[PDB]
Amino acid sequence: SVPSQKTYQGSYGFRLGFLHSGTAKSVTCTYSPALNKLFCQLAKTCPVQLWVDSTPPPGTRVRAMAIYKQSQHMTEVVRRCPHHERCSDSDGLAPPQHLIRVEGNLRAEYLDDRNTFRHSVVVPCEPPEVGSDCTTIHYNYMCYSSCMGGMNRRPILTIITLEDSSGNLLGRDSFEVRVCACPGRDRRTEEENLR
Template identity: 70%
Template sequence: MDEPGDSQEFADLWNLNLIELPTENGDWDDVFGRTGLEFPVPAAGFAQDGGSPPGSTVPTTSDYPGDHSFHLSFPHSSCAKSVTCTYSPDLNKLFCQLAKTCPVQMVVEQPPPPGAMVRATAVYKKSDHVAEVVKRCPHHERTPENNDGAAPPSHLIRVEGNQRALYHEDANTFRQSVVVPYEPPQLGSEWTTVLYNFMCNSSCMGGMNRRPILTIITLETNEGLVLGRRSFEVRVCACPGRDRKTEESNFRKQQETSAASQVSVSSSKRSAKEAPSSDVSAAKKAKSSSSTEEEVFTLQVHGRERYLMLKKINDSLELNDLVPPADVDKYRQRLNPKSSNKRDKEPKRGKRLLLKEEKSDSDSVNE
């Protein structure tokens, strides 16, 4: 038989397990307070590297100027073969060499709040690859060249000349980005310039592998709220000027082809609309030719004068159908007997008919 002390301890332990659950309006904190237990309460959101909010699985690439009218500009550059970075406004595409300086100018009409940041993220352009994370190829990631800085070797986009740049990797999506504090334009300037480097070629196997990418530039608050967004396509290649010239030429050809196709489509639509009317008219002609002469048609005429003229023509045709052809000829001869005789006596062209009193020139000479 158990001792009384053991029974009392068992009863106390049993009472501890009988926790009254909270009602509909109750709070779990009250329950934990009664039991004397402490549990950590999870935070509202996950933040990595000191304040970076979790990113979406598929980042948005659409432009969003926001209340600050955030937009980008690029220095003017030619298509020369020696150029290391050039931007095409027609294509909204940046052509650059590996690890070369690419200046991007940030412009706002209204200054953002203090502590604002500028974030750059690379994503694949096509929907087939947009879920994949854009990283450097294994070759460039492992080679010592261009890997001696503070940036992680796997990051494609780096910031040049800014010691306050922070490199982030989202804990959920593993997407990589680089963040720099927003700096207001210097006196006499309208934009803030950030120098970016792209650390892998677009044709690298195991990396981008010729898949086009977009660079998303976002203006954010210190808490991660997006104030503005812009994006542009990037191609990292050996000869940016040549590739820009080639792609712009192909783009113009495509525009000309699409314009010509639109013209042909519109003309075909017009011909298709006109075709039924021509078919109807042809059918009417065939029907009229095959129909008997007893069929009656209605003709609408504008103006009374034209109506009377056409009525006279119709009456004469009706009369012509009633009178036999021989009687019509006799009637015409009776109407114009003098004109017919005059036509018979009319001499041929070049000769004049002499009267009895007149003499010819030859007769007068003989006399």
């Protein structure tokens, strides 16, 4: 009833990477290594690098899923709030209830788990382009952390899993996410609080 969040590089040396976007007031997505926390604006591009030490098999996939970070909320499905699930901002592929979308990939698949009712979005692994050492996926988060009747100010984690063609676990990594109006300011504030 609770997805694992244990970091696991596995046989292929799987791990995430994040850009260095800084903390200017205008920044739309920014990652804090000290907090292991991504700060982003609503529905804006969040680039996440997918690193491996060795090539996984054809048919390997990468899945993203959100869970609540606090243990007392972890069995609750993370979903869009009663406003945003109804605001008709469909991209033609993501169900309107899903918090996490993949941008610009027609092979993205959206799962409503028939047993756990959790949402996830999964894409096929592709080889890096010539000149690149990794591929990058672009996520969008479709509700604010503060949305009433939804996340309601509760922090979430995103869990990224590398899966074989059956859905078996090959690798796992994760990061906290705050979806907010001013990611640069909030990253600076939280890093200062940590210090």
